[PDB]
Amino acid sequence: LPPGWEKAMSRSSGRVYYFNHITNASQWERPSEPARVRCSHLLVKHSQSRRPSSWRQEKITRTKEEALELINGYIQKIKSGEEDFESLASQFSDCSSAKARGDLGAFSRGQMQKPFEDASFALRTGEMSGPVFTDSGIHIILRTE
């Protein structure tokens, strides 16, 4: 399995699924290193975020668990198709890159926070991560290139 993927057992169904411990993505299908990848991300800060402020809200008061619920809900709406990633990041991302539909443009290793970097280069083009915890908050990373 590609870097970070591992088999696990569904404790509801008993059916086998795959999770990645780098990106926090889990899926049912069996899954399938570039100098540069291109990502968008959706950020949801919390009161233990490095800077608990955003264009959305001068004083971010939600907790870290509440930040996770929101992220999980967004992950659910993206993955159901009831919303797409660009729409949610524009409305709800605590990162001012929301003004560019999440897009951060392309980067290489050594520029970002290491957990974000790791999740990003362990995404395949067109893949979305799970919640990705950094000091800014919790991320949904989409790798677009």
The experimental technique behind this entry is: X-ray
Domain 33-143 has CATH 3.90.180.10: no
Active site residues: 41, 95, 113, 136, 139
Which residue's structure tokens are 């800060």? 45
DSSP for 14-47 reads --EEEEETTT--EESSPP---S-EEEEEEEE--T
Largest CA distance in the chain: 45
- The CA distances from residue 86 to 22, 46, 65, 104, 136, in Å, are 23, 21, 24, 12, 20
